[PDB]
Amino acid sequence: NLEDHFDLAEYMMKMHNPMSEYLYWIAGFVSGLHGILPLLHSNYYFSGMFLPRDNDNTQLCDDSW
Amino acid sequence: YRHWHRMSEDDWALPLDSMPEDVKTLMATPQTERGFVEDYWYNRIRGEATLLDPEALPSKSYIALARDMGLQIVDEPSSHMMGLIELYEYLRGASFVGPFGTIENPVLVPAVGQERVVACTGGVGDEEHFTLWFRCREGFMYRCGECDQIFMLVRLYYEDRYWTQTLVRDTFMSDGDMFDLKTLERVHKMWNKDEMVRWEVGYWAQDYVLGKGVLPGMVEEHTRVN
Amino acid sequence: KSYYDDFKDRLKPGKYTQGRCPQSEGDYRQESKTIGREHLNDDGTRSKRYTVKEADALGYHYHPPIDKKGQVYVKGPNTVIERGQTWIKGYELPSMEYTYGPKQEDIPFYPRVKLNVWGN
Amino acid sequence: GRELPEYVVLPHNQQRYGRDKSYSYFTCLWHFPKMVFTEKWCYTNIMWFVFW
Amino acid sequence: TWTEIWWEHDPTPKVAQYRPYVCTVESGKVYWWCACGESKTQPWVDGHCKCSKREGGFRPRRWEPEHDGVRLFCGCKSCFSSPTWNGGCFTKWMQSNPAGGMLYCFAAAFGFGTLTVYRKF
Amino acid sequence: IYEGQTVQESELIPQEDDWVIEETNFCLGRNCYVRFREEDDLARRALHQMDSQLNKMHTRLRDGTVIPYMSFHPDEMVDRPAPIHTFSEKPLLKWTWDETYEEAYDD
Amino acid sequence: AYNGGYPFHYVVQYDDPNYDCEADFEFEEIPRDEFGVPAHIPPELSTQIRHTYYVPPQYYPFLKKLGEDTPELKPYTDKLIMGDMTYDDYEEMFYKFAKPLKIYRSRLPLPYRTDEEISQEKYVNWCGRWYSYRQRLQGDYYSRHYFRDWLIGVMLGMYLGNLCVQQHRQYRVDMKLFYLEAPEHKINWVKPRGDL
Amino acid sequence: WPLWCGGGVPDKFIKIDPDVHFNLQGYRERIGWYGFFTAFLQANYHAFVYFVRFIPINIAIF
Amino acid sequence: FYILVNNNKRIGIYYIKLSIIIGILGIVLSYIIRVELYNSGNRIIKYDNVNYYNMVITLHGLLMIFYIIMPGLYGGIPLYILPILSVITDIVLPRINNISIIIVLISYIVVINSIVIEYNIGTGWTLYPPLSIIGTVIVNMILYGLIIIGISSIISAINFMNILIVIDGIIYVYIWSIIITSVLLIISLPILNGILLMILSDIYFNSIYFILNGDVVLYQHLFWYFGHPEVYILILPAFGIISIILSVLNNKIIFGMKSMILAIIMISILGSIVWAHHIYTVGLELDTKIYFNNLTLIISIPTGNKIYNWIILYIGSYNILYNGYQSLIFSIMFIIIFIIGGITGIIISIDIIDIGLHDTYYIVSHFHYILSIGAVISLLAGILLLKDIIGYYNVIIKINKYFGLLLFININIIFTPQFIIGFNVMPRRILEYSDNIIVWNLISSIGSISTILILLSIF
Ligand SMILES: CCCCCCCCCCCCCCCCCC(=O)OC[C@H](COP(=O)([O-])OCC(O)COP(=O)([O-])OC[C@@H](COC(=O)CCCCCCCCCCCCCCCCC)OC(=O)CCCCCCCCCCCCCCCCC)OC(=O)CCCCCCCCCCCCCCCCC
Ligand code: HEA
Ligand code: HEA
Ligand SMILES: [O-][O-]
Ligand SMILES: [Cu+2]
Ligand SMILES: [K+]
Ligand SMILES: [Zn+2]
Ligand SMILES: [Zn+2]
Ligand SMILES: [Zn+2]
């Protein structure tokens, strides 16, 4: 059939449902979260804060904020 | 061809259990209306009926003898088609090498469709260039942009069909006089008598014309267990 | 000149985001009921039944194409006999304006030149 | 062997589909959540997956 | 020197100028460049030169800018990037006045040598 | 190394004094994204795509022969975008040699 | 010369008319070959024995007619009549009379070209030769120009490299004077800090 | 075998008609749930044949 | 269907799609690293969570090498065009091709799941023992991923080798590039599997190979016997692409085709015998060091021949053709960038220079210029060349001079300063550093944030 000639015919003929694209981007977004979420979780687990304050592991001036 | 695998047993002959049981209608069917199995057994029954009648062979012309065996007398039209068919089949698993193409004699590119991908490598020796691929569509005399080698597409097309051995046989072969069942019976009695069958195909064929199970031992031959 | 103005008429701006109405206003997920379109959805995409649930490669809707004589339909060439010779007229593709839109005029000239090869 | 017409006239007169409307960079930020919570085929597939 | 000593079957232009012509050009407009060097509306074809009359293998050279701006155009009529200028006007001049070419090249190399040596040293 | 086809001076001699090099444009035309009609369905948009293939285009010379779209590699010979099944009929790479046999000729 | 001499397909005969090599499990029946040689006579011996085809004498007049109509075929038919045709003789006869299929170029439809176009064939060939002449000459011209230019790059890369050679040269001179004259070099200066 | 060593089966003795063997449209309704279980079990005859030949030696080792 | 498809061209698309997805995780990890290194102090990782940084650098390396660039250059472009270049209908082993991509995805899920569930610790992507064998279960999970990935790589290599049996045309340079990478995989992977099994034995089976009286340097030999062939398994497909692009876009036949092919074969043989240039500082024997240093410098000869053959491909091309296409720019940029990476490789090849530059950010910049810049750009250039054939859209890349310029400038801002800090010296695989190295680290960090922003403009 003419519809079956091209692989991924709906996408190539520009008729595909946009949800397929959204899922692909969502999947990539979830993959990215696997580097950020465990960072926050591990920081809180061993420190009690989700993220540090720059240079809070060193001596700071009295007025430092 | 080198690309084909090993001959099957069927490539030599078919089992007699594949003979159509309605022999009377089989021998009356026109060639264009006979299928592959029906055409095999029409030719074998009729061809062996004439070959197993020695006294009539010397008086039979080659035109009539070829018709009985089912062989097609060759002519330029059919030879052209068959030749281009076999050339197409050979090129399926073989290299494509030949003389340099010119306007007088273009490179012949056989195809079934309306297009076939072709590459030009130029001439021989220093005139050979890198592969230049192009799509050879029908109805255009192609010229390589580099060496000016002329190409042309040849289509194996005839009347809404492509060219096959079956198509060539149907289009050019003409059915002769209708096969006479009396000849089958006469030859049958010649080589099959007193429990000796020296024409097994004609013993089975005569049995079917008689209605299946009539001749001695044929009911036992047709009784199977699985 | 502006070549976009030549085919502006063909390009009518769209109404729906992503070219589909809300499924409530029209259910594009269902198979079309139009005769001869049982393999397509309402929006024109191939139906899951045709491609997945009842795919022919899995044994559904078994229909051998080849006929008894081992033949399939083939469309012949455009043959034109002339000057004591049978000719075939090749099929020329439509004007690129029809398929792409720009009007095929004022095309820059790119001459034929054989391959640029290093010599000596 | 099946016989079909050259064209068919549909019973409805709704032009449901067509060219995309012009979209901006962040159009997806509202269109995607709209599909999830408003298109049946999307939220029935999500609930089915979560439940099982 | 392709036309001069190697190949005698291509048209050979006349040098209008051994310097590029500076012109303001607009995107979406097509310009026609003189390839014979005899037009009086340089760098464009005037309708009376060889290019306009399609004489002796001379034809106008079509050109169109992508963006608006000021572009340099070939006056020597032999630049590799013609109609645009890439320095071939100076190169062709050196072929015609090799003594002058050496003077400029020495001066350019002298400046380049001094600056690069002064900074690195 | 390849340096073009060899030419004999006899082949460079014209049959008329006005012969020059044919000025045929080998720019196929002006193109852009293939533009589908909204009215066309999936089947008819497939036909549209198949009719916009640059590799099916050619340039016809003064003698009626056409120089086709050519490429160094067969990757540019399939329809764009690539269909599921491309080379159903095996592409033929034509080699040339000087060998001949008598059966091919007739006196 | 293929498969060790074993034919892919061969005929086997059995004396008992109701014998089945798959159903029966008896141990007395000896199979025969196509010529009828019992299996217990080894191939090396049976292949030496000369086997010839015997047709019924009623066929002799037909085989005679074939020889006369085709004199090249007569010697083979005579062998068959006289019972001197082996399998090898039959094979020689078979392949001797096999002919290749013929293709006629005069029957091929041609791509459409007008009579005006057909008269321009010499002109187009003439243009092609001049294009090949110009191509070949340009190859020599370009090869000379660009490979010569690459020398400018060598010289530019030799100048820029020499700049770092001079810097390195001065560096080594400076290093030799550090421990000898430089006041930056200090001895009996650093004292141990000690543990904190 | 339907390979070089053998060939096709005569029509008189064919028992699996492809027209009926294929065309699985709504086959689950025709076979029912127990039929579905039967078909799954019968689809693994090849794997069953192997396990019947493989297990004994492993029992001996054990 | 989607997962059941055996089409070789569809599977090629899957490989590119998955490489981009997994690539998002890779780039995110890179941003974490550069953010942390912006100054001295703790910025986004606590001092009590320093183990996370060690895991970030480990996963970054492993994912980018085995789950992104290798699946993209050896799985993606190859599976889509190789059967077409070979004028064959489809790939020789259809079912094997399907399982290979599924295997890659399953091993990726295992790795990322191990981030979420296991304690986060790191031992580098080179998994040196004894550190690798005294760690927690996350190391066990990573080992399973590598072994599973190895299965996919070897079966894919078998698939490509079978093209020699079916190729109906001429073996083009690109086809030669993939075949040789396949050979390199068939010979190197079995050795890797063995040493990985020994790491498992010590982790999980109470083996003692990597404790006293057992030589830990043994692992480094077997690992790098696969390690360096891996870097050429990742670059050779890129070379094959560069050859096609330059010839096609410049309309020039490849010059010295046989020398290109024989250069690829040579690089492979030499690359299979130079692994110990990664082990210069362990204390190997003088003659061994001299052998490996000598043979390592030889690899430049065949690699140099290919570079110069590419240059002449671009030289002399017609001026009328527009040269601003992204694919052409990337192909040219590869030559300019690869020379930088290779030359620095020759510098580090001298062992005495290497003593100073081992385990410093100079090594980082060296292999980034080749992989993070050269290999990435080659994959982009190859996909861009096949845009019409592949058929993807909804991106502005094909003609985007801004993207190319911004990428080139900013990528160099990241890694050029890493060459400087190599003589400062700033060790690798560290997060805290002395205050006098902030300037260069800060400049590179500004480069990383900028490159990420440019990745958003393509959409
Ligand atoms: C490096 C980046 C930058 C790169 C730049 C350079 C790029 C250069 C160009 C490269 C080009 C490469 C080649 C491209 C070829 C494209 C071919 C193509 O389009 O094929 C057609 C193919 C399919 O089209 P089709 O043929 O119409 O398919 C029809 C379907 O088969 C059938 O349709 P259907 O509707 O029936 O479909 C079924 C559907 C049914 O779907 C639905 O029903 C969906 C319903 C809505 C759901 C929406 C998501 C909801 C999420 C909720 C989250 C809640 C979180 C709450 C948190 C709370 C916290 C408090 O889906 C499913 O049922 C399964 C979906 C599974 C996949 C999605 C998975 C998502 C992530 C899951 C994570 C799970 C983690 C678990 C962890 C557990 C731990 C314990 O297209 C796609 O799949 C889309 C591709 C789109 C991109 C193409 C490339 C474009 C160019 C590049 C753009 C840049 C991309 C950058 C990367 C992404 C960045 C983010
Ligand atoms: C694809 C990636 C890739 C490529 C191609 C290379 C190529 C080379 N690499 Fe590699 N290298 C890596 C990836 C790569 N490398 C990685 C990822 C590491 C670190 C792994 C880790 O430690 O964790 C590494 C580490 C590494 C080290 C370790 C340094 C250290 O541990 O302290 C060394 C030193 O020998 C080295 C050398 C080389 C050499 C000599 C080449 C040669 O191939 C370069 C050849 C190219 C040229 C030489 C330029 C082109 C040729 C010419 C221009 C000809 C003229 C030039 C000359 C005559 C010299 N590399
Ligand atoms: C090919 C693999 C690869 C790639 C692309 C990169 C890309 C980058 N890497 Fe790389 N990196 C490694 C492999 C890679 N790296 C390895 C193997 C190590 C050593 C691990 C270890 O020490 O144990 C390492 C280490 C490493 C460190 C050292 C941390 C440390 O150990 O102390 C740092 C930060 O300085 C860093 C930064 C970056 C940055 C900023 C980018 C890039 O973000 C730069 C910007 C470029 C882009 C954002 C484009 C990338 C896009 C893609 C990859 C997708 C391509 C897909 C298609 C084209 C379909 N890397
Ligand atoms: O590793 O080079
Ligand atoms: Cu190495
Ligand atoms: K820090
Ligand atoms: Zn040619
Ligand atoms: Zn003029
Ligand atoms: Zn000029």
JSON list of N, CA, C and O in Angstrom, two decimals, chain B residues 6-7 9 51-52 58 60 62 76 79-80 86 105-106 139 146 148 152, chain G residues 8-9 58-59 65-66 69 101-102 104-105 107-108 111 124 128 135:
[
{"chain": "B", "resi": 6, "resn": "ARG", "atom": "N", "xyz": [20.10, -26.48, -3.94]},
{"chain": "B", "resi": 6, "resn": "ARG", "atom": "CA", "xyz": [20.17, -27.80, -4.57]},
{"chain": "B", "resi": 6, "resn": "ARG", "atom": "C", "xyz": [18.83, -28.21, -5.17]},
{"chain": "B", "resi": 6, "resn": "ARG", "atom": "O", "xyz": [17.77, -27.99, -4.56]},
{"chain": "B", "resi": 7, "resn": "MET", "atom": "N", "xyz": [18.87, -28.84, -6.35]},
{"chain": "B", "resi": 7, "resn": "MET", "atom": "CA", "xyz": [17.68, -29.43, -6.95]},
{"chain": "B", "resi": 7, "resn": "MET", "atom": "C", "xyz": [16.86, -30.20, -5.92]},
{"chain": "B", "resi": 7, "resn": "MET", "atom": "O", "xyz": [17.41, -30.97, -5.12]},
{"chain": "B", "resi": 9, "resn": "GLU", "atom": "N", "xyz": [13.72, -33.06, -5.20]},
{"chain": "B", "resi": 9, "resn": "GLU", "atom": "CA", "xyz": [13.21, -34.24, -5.88]},
{"chain": "B", "resi": 9, "resn": "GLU", "atom": "C", "xyz": [12.13, -33.85, -6.89]},
{"chain": "B", "resi": 9, "resn": "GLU", "atom": "O", "xyz": [12.05, -34.43, -7.98]},
{"chain": "B", "resi": 51, "resn": "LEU", "atom": "N", "xyz": [5.44, -41.23, -26.89]},
{"chain": "B", "resi": 51, "resn": "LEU", "atom": "CA", "xyz": [6.77, -41.83, -26.87]},
{"chain": "B", "resi": 51, "resn": "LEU", "atom": "C", "xyz": [6.71, -43.34, -26.67]},
{"chain": "B", "resi": 51, "resn": "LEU", "atom": "O", "xyz": [7.59, -44.06, -27.14]},
{"chain": "B", "resi": 52, "resn": "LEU", "atom": "N", "xyz": [5.68, -43.83, -25.97]},
{"chain": "B", "resi": 52, "resn": "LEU", "atom": "CA", "xyz": [5.52, -45.25, -25.74]},
{"chain": "B", "resi": 52, "resn": "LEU", "atom": "C", "xyz": [4.72, -45.93, -26.85]},
{"chain": "B", "resi": 52, "resn": "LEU", "atom": "O", "xyz": [4.16, -47.01, -26.62]},
{"chain": "B", "resi": 58, "resn": "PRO", "atom": "N", "xyz": [8.17, -42.74, -36.15]},
{"chain": "B", "resi": 58, "resn": "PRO", "atom": "CA", "xyz": [8.85, -42.35, -37.40]},
{"chain": "B", "resi": 58, "resn": "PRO", "atom": "C", "xyz": [7.98, -41.55, -38.35]},
{"chain": "B", "resi": 58, "resn": "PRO", "atom": "O", "xyz": [8.51, -40.73, -39.11]},
{"chain": "B", "resi": 60, "resn": "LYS", "atom": "N", "xyz": [5.72, -39.36, -37.43]},
{"chain": "B", "resi": 60, "resn": "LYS", "atom": "CA", "xyz": [5.28, -38.15, -36.77]},
{"chain": "B", "resi": 60, "resn": "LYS", "atom": "C", "xyz": [6.29, -37.04, -37.00]},
{"chain": "B", "resi": 60, "resn": "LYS", "atom": "O", "xyz": [7.50, -37.24, -36.80]},
{"chain": "B", "resi": 62, "resn": "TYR", "atom": "N", "xyz": [8.36, -33.46, -36.50]},
{"chain": "B", "resi": 62, "resn": "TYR", "atom": "CA", "xyz": [8.94, -32.81, -35.33]},
{"chain": "B", "resi": 62, "resn": "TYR", "atom": "C", "xyz": [8.00, -31.76, -34.75]},
{"chain": "B", "resi": 62, "resn": "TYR", "atom": "O", "xyz": [7.97, -31.56, -33.53]},
{"chain": "B", "resi": 76, "resn": "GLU", "atom": "N", "xyz": [11.91, -16.06, -33.09]},
{"chain": "B", "resi": 76, "resn": "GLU", "atom": "CA", "xyz": [12.60, -14.86, -32.63]},
{"chain": "B", "resi": 76, "resn": "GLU", "atom": "C", "xyz": [11.85, -14.15, -31.51]},
{"chain": "B", "resi": 76, "resn": "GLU", "atom": "O", "xyz": [12.50, -13.77, -30.51]},
{"chain": "B", "resi": 79, "resn": "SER", "atom": "N", "xyz": [12.31, -16.36, -28.36]},
{"chain": "B", "resi": 79, "resn": "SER", "atom": "CA", "xyz": [13.72, -16.44, -28.01]},
{"chain": "B", "resi": 79, "resn": "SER", "atom": "C", "xyz": [14.18, -15.16, -27.33]},
{"chain": "B", "resi": 79, "resn": "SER", "atom": "O", "xyz": [14.90, -15.20, -26.32]},
{"chain": "B", "resi": 80, "resn": "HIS", "atom": "N", "xyz": [13.79, -14.01, -27.87]},
{"chain": "B", "resi": 80, "resn": "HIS", "atom": "CA", "xyz": [14.11, -12.72, -27.27]},
{"chain": "B", "resi": 80, "resn": "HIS", "atom": "C", "xyz": [13.65, -12.66, -25.82]},
{"chain": "B", "resi": 80, "resn": "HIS", "atom": "O", "xyz": [14.41, -12.32, -24.92]},
{"chain": "B", "resi": 86, "resn": "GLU", "atom": "N", "xyz": [16.31, -15.09, -18.83]},
{"chain": "B", "resi": 86, "resn": "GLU", "atom": "CA", "xyz": [17.46, -15.78, -18.25]},
{"chain": "B", "resi": 86, "resn": "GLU", "atom": "C", "xyz": [18.58, -14.81, -17.93]},
{"chain": "B", "resi": 86, "resn": "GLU", "atom": "O", "xyz": [19.35, -15.05, -16.99]},
{"chain": "B", "resi": 105, "resn": "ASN", "atom": "N", "xyz": [24.41, 0.93, -29.55]},
{"chain": "B", "resi": 105, "resn": "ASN", "atom": "CA", "xyz": [24.20, -0.24, -28.71]},
{"chain": "B", "resi": 105, "resn": "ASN", "atom": "C", "xyz": [24.29, 0.16, -27.25]},
{"chain": "B", "resi": 105, "resn": "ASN", "atom": "O", "xyz": [25.34, -0.01, -26.61]},
{"chain": "B", "resi": 106, "resn": "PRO", "atom": "N", "xyz": [23.21, 0.69, -26.68]},
{"chain": "B", "resi": 106, "resn": "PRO", "atom": "CA", "xyz": [23.23, 1.06, -25.26]},
{"chain": "B", "resi": 106, "resn": "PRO", "atom": "C", "xyz": [23.41, -0.15, -24.36]},
{"chain": "B", "resi": 106, "resn": "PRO", "atom": "O", "xyz": [23.07, -1.28, -24.72]},
{"chain": "B", "resi": 139, "resn": "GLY", "atom": "N", "xyz": [12.11, 4.89, -20.73]},
{"chain": "B", "resi": 139, "resn": "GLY", "atom": "CA", "xyz": [11.78, 5.92, -21.69]},
{"chain": "B", "resi": 139, "resn": "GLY", "atom": "C", "xyz": [12.79, 7.03, -21.83]},
{"chain": "B", "resi": 139, "resn": "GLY", "atom": "O", "xyz": [12.48, 8.04, -22.48]},
{"chain": "B", "resi": 146, "resn": "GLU", "atom": "N", "xyz": [30.21, 11.62, -16.96]},
{"chain": "B", "resi": 146, "resn": "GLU", "atom": "CA", "xyz": [31.66, 11.56, -16.89]},
{"chain": "B", "resi": 146, "resn": "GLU", "atom": "C", "xyz": [32.30, 10.95, -18.13]},
{"chain": "B", "resi": 146, "resn": "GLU", "atom": "O", "xyz": [33.18, 11.55, -18.74]},
{"chain": "B", "resi": 148, "resn": "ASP", "atom": "N", "xyz": [30.34, 9.55, -20.77]},
{"chain": "B", "resi": 148, "resn": "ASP", "atom": "CA", "xyz": [29.38, 9.57, -21.87]},
{"chain": "B", "resi": 148, "resn": "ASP", "atom": "C", "xyz": [28.95, 8.17, -22.29]},
{"chain": "B", "resi": 148, "resn": "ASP", "atom": "O", "xyz": [28.64, 7.93, -23.46]},
{"chain": "B", "resi": 152, "resn": "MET", "atom": "N", "xyz": [20.31, 2.23, -21.26]},
{"chain": "B", "resi": 152, "resn": "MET", "atom": "CA", "xyz": [18.90, 2.15, -21.60]},
{"chain": "B", "resi": 152, "resn": "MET", "atom": "C", "xyz": [18.26, 1.05, -20.77]},
{"chain": "B", "resi": 152, "resn": "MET", "atom": "O", "xyz": [18.88, 0.02, -20.50]},
{"chain": "G", "resi": 8, "resn": "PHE", "atom": "N", "xyz": [23.70, -36.08, -5.37]},
{"chain": "G", "resi": 8, "resn": "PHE", "atom": "CA", "xyz": [22.70, -35.53, -4.45]},
{"chain": "G", "resi": 8, "resn": "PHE", "atom": "C", "xyz": [21.42, -36.35, -4.51]},
{"chain": "G", "resi": 8, "resn": "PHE", "atom": "O", "xyz": [20.83, -36.68, -3.47]},
{"chain": "G", "resi": 9, "resn": "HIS", "atom": "N", "xyz": [20.97, -36.71, -5.71]},
{"chain": "G", "resi": 9, "resn": "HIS", "atom": "CA", "xyz": [19.79, -37.54, -5.92]},
{"chain": "G", "resi": 9, "resn": "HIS", "atom": "C", "xyz": [20.16, -38.77, -6.73]},
{"chain": "G", "resi": 9, "resn": "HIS", "atom": "O", "xyz": [20.88, -38.67, -7.73]},
{"chain": "G", "resi": 58, "resn": "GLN", "atom": "N", "xyz": [11.49, -52.00, -31.49]},
{"chain": "G", "resi": 58, "resn": "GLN", "atom": "CA", "xyz": [10.52, -51.21, -32.23]},
{"chain": "G", "resi": 58, "resn": "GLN", "atom": "C", "xyz": [10.92, -49.74, -32.32]},
{"chain": "G", "resi": 58, "resn": "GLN", "atom": "O", "xyz": [10.38, -49.02, -33.16]},
{"chain": "G", "resi": 59, "resn": "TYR", "atom": "N", "xyz": [11.85, -49.29, -31.47]},
{"chain": "G", "resi": 59, "resn": "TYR", "atom": "CA", "xyz": [12.32, -47.92, -31.53]},
{"chain": "G", "resi": 59, "resn": "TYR", "atom": "C", "xyz": [13.44, -47.70, -32.53]},
{"chain": "G", "resi": 59, "resn": "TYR", "atom": "O", "xyz": [13.74, -46.55, -32.86]},
{"chain": "G", "resi": 65, "resn": "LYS", "atom": "N", "xyz": [15.64, -42.50, -37.99]},
{"chain": "G", "resi": 65, "resn": "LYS", "atom": "CA", "xyz": [15.16, -41.26, -38.58]},
{"chain": "G", "resi": 65, "resn": "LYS", "atom": "C", "xyz": [15.86, -40.05, -37.98]},
{"chain": "G", "resi": 65, "resn": "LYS", "atom": "O", "xyz": [16.17, -39.09, -38.69]},
{"chain": "G", "resi": 66, "resn": "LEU", "atom": "N", "xyz": [16.10, -40.08, -36.67]},
{"chain": "G", "resi": 66, "resn": "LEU", "atom": "CA", "xyz": [16.77, -38.96, -36.02]},
{"chain": "G", "resi": 66, "resn": "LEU", "atom": "C", "xyz": [18.18, -38.77, -36.57]},
{"chain": "G", "resi": 66, "resn": "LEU", "atom": "O", "xyz": [18.61, -37.64, -36.81]},
{"chain": "G", "resi": 69, "resn": "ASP", "atom": "N", "xyz": [18.08, -37.17, -40.23]},
{"chain": "G", "resi": 69, "resn": "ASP", "atom": "CA", "xyz": [17.70, -35.76, -40.29]},
{"chain": "G", "resi": 69, "resn": "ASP", "atom": "C", "xyz": [18.78, -34.86, -39.71]},
{"chain": "G", "resi": 69, "resn": "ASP", "atom": "O", "xyz": [18.92, -33.71, -40.14]},
{"chain": "G", "resi": 101, "resn": "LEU", "atom": "N", "xyz": [20.05, -19.17, -25.48]},
{"chain": "G", "resi": 101, "resn": "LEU", "atom": "CA", "xyz": [18.96, -18.32, -25.91]},
{"chain": "G", "resi": 101, "resn": "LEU", "atom": "C", "xyz": [19.51, -17.04, -26.54]},
{"chain": "G", "resi": 101, "resn": "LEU", "atom": "O", "xyz": [20.55, -16.51, -26.13]},
{"chain": "G", "resi": 102, "resn": "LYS", "atom": "N", "xyz": [18.80, -16.54, -27.56]},
{"chain": "G", "resi": 102, "resn": "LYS", "atom": "CA", "xyz": [19.24, -15.40, -28.35]},
{"chain": "G", "resi": 102, "resn": "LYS", "atom": "C", "xyz": [18.40, -14.17, -28.05]},
{"chain": "G", "resi": 102, "resn": "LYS", "atom": "O", "xyz": [17.17, -14.25, -27.98]},
{"chain": "G", "resi": 104, "resn": "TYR", "atom": "N", "xyz": [17.56, -10.25, -29.39]},
{"chain": "G", "resi": 104, "resn": "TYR", "atom": "CA", "xyz": [17.59, -9.41, -30.58]},
{"chain": "G", "resi": 104, "resn": "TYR", "atom": "C", "xyz": [17.42, -7.95, -30.17]},
{"chain": "G", "resi": 104, "resn": "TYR", "atom": "O", "xyz": [16.36, -7.57, -29.66]},
{"chain": "G", "resi": 105, "resn": "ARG", "atom": "N", "xyz": [18.46, -7.15, -30.40]},
{"chain": "G", "resi": 105, "resn": "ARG", "atom": "CA", "xyz": [18.38, -5.73, -30.08]},
{"chain": "G", "resi": 105, "resn": "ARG", "atom": "C", "xyz": [17.39, -4.99, -30.97]},
{"chain": "G", "resi": 105, "resn": "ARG", "atom": "O", "xyz": [16.88, -3.94, -30.56]},
{"chain": "G", "resi": 107, "resn": "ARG", "atom": "N", "xyz": [14.46, -5.67, -31.57]},
{"chain": "G", "resi": 107, "resn": "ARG", "atom": "CA", "xyz": [13.11, -5.77, -31.03]},
{"chain": "G", "resi": 107, "resn": "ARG", "atom": "C", "xyz": [12.91, -4.91, -29.78]},
{"chain": "G", "resi": 107, "resn": "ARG", "atom": "O", "xyz": [11.80, -4.88, -29.25]},
{"chain": "G", "resi": 108, "resn": "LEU", "atom": "N", "xyz": [13.94, -4.23, -29.32]},
{"chain": "G", "resi": 108, "resn": "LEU", "atom": "CA", "xyz": [13.82, -3.42, -28.11]},
{"chain": "G", "resi": 108, "resn": "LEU", "atom": "C", "xyz": [13.21, -2.06, -28.46]},
{"chain": "G", "resi": 108, "resn": "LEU", "atom": "O", "xyz": [13.75, -1.36, -29.32]},
{"chain": "G", "resi": 111, "resn": "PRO", "atom": "N", "xyz": [13.88, 4.64, -26.22]},
{"chain": "G", "resi": 111, "resn": "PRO", "atom": "CA", "xyz": [13.39, 5.89, -25.63]},
{"chain": "G", "resi": 111, "resn": "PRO", "atom": "C", "xyz": [13.13, 6.93, -26.71]},
{"chain": "G", "resi": 111, "resn": "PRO", "atom": "O", "xyz": [13.87, 7.03, -27.69]},
{"chain": "G", "resi": 124, "resn": "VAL", "atom": "N", "xyz": [26.88, 16.48, -29.66]},
{"chain": "G", "resi": 124, "resn": "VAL", "atom": "CA", "xyz": [26.96, 16.21, -28.23]},
{"chain": "G", "resi": 124, "resn": "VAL", "atom": "C", "xyz": [28.22, 15.41, -27.91]},
{"chain": "G", "resi": 124, "resn": "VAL", "atom": "O", "xyz": [28.88, 15.65, -26.89]},
{"chain": "G", "resi": 128, "resn": "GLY", "atom": "N", "xyz": [31.38, 16.48, -25.47]},
{"chain": "G", "resi": 128, "resn": "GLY", "atom": "CA", "xyz": [31.89, 15.63, -24.42]},
{"chain": "G", "resi": 128, "resn": "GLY", "atom": "C", "xyz": [33.39, 15.46, -24.48]},
{"chain": "G", "resi": 128, "resn": "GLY", "atom": "O", "xyz": [34.06, 15.39, -23.44]},
{"chain": "G", "resi": 135, "resn": "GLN", "atom": "N", "xyz": [39.00, 18.98, -18.77]},
{"chain": "G", "resi": 135, "resn": "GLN", "atom": "CA", "xyz": [39.13, 18.38, -17.45]},
{"chain": "G", "resi": 135, "resn": "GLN", "atom": "C", "xyz": [40.56, 17.91, -17.20]},
{"chain": "G", "resi": 135, "resn": "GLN", "atom": "O", "xyz": [41.15, 18.20, -16.16]}
]
